[PDB]
Amino acid sequence: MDDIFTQCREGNAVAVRLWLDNTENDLNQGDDHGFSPLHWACREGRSAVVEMLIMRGARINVMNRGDDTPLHLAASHGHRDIVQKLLQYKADINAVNEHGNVPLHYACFWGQDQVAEDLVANGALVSICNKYGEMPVDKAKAPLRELLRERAEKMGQNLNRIPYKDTFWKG
Amino acid sequence: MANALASATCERCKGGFAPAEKIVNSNGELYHEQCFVCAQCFQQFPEGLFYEFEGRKYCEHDFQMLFAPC
Numbered sequence: 660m661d662d663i664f665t666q667c668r669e670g671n672a673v674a675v676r677l678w679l680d681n682t683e684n685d686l687n688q689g690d691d692h693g694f695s696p697l698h699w700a701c702r703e704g705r706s707a708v709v710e711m712l713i714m715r716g717a718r719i720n721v722m723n724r725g726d727d728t729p730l731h732l733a734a735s736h737g738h739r740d741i742v743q744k745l746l747q748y749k750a751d752i753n754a755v756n757e758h759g760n761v762p763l764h765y766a767c768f769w770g771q772d773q774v775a776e777d778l779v780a781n782g783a784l785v786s787i788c789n790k791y792g793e794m795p796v797d798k799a800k801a802p803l804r805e806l807l808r809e810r811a812e813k814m815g816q817n818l819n820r821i822p823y824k825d826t827f828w829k830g
Numbered sequence: 831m832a833n834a835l836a837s838a839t840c841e842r843c844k845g846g847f848a849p850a851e852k853i854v855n856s857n858g859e860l861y862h863e864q865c866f867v868c869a870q871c872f873q874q875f876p877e878g879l880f881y882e883f884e885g886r887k888y889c890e891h892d893f894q895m896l897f898a899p900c
């Protein structure tokens with residue numbers, strides 16, 4: 660019963676747009692923790708109402724008070740569509756939070772192969788290697804898919820010629 | 831002879847444990863202590879105490895931080 664905030668997520672996409680039209684520009688207040696409307700909206704899933712917000716002037720390169728970019732939350736939601744238009748606006752995937760969590764780490768943490776592809780489809784490299792190598796390859800090698808492993812390694816890893824040019828060439 | 835007497839699966843990795851091996855029940859759903867991972871700290875939680883909030887799970891500690899001031 661959070662009044663408009665609760666009624667807003669009621670799916671009444673019309674009720675959230677209704678108070679968002681603040682002719683005084685103030686109701687655009689976040690939360691005591693600094694949560695922004697865009698933040699909550701990003702995880703809600705109503706691409707419509709949030710899409711328009713991002714057009715009002717809200718930037719995607721925003722860090723919540725807890726340190727969390729919408730990119731993470733976006734993939735942590737499961738809305739393939741929002742991700743595509745949300746990740747194609749500034750491609751701030753090359754901008755992790757404070758722990759280094761890349762949108763792909765979370766994308767596979769839940770189970771989104773499609774979106775995971777569009778992420779490395781820029782160059783994020785699926786073989787990034789988190790802080791301890793905690794990358795989808797391992798979380799994917801556990802279930803034993805082998806399906807995305809080959810596609811992942813078929814990008815340039817399994818057939819890796821012995822790298823050189825950095826050991827016997829000078830002294 | 832075949833076999834594969836698997837039964838009961840992780841409620842998060844969908845693995846299949848023999849469940850007095852390493853399976854963890856929290857509320858009524860089963861999770862490997864491997865499925866016991868903090869979404870921030872999703873490195874396994876030490877001593878296995880975890881708290882779930884809004885679709886993401888955080889040790890209580892972080893959960894309050896998102897859920898309350900600090």
Ligand SMILES: [Zn+2]
Nearest residue numbers: 840843862865
């Ligand atoms: Zn499991």
Ligand SMILES: [Zn+2]
Nearest residue numbers: 868871888889
């Ligand atoms: Zn935690």
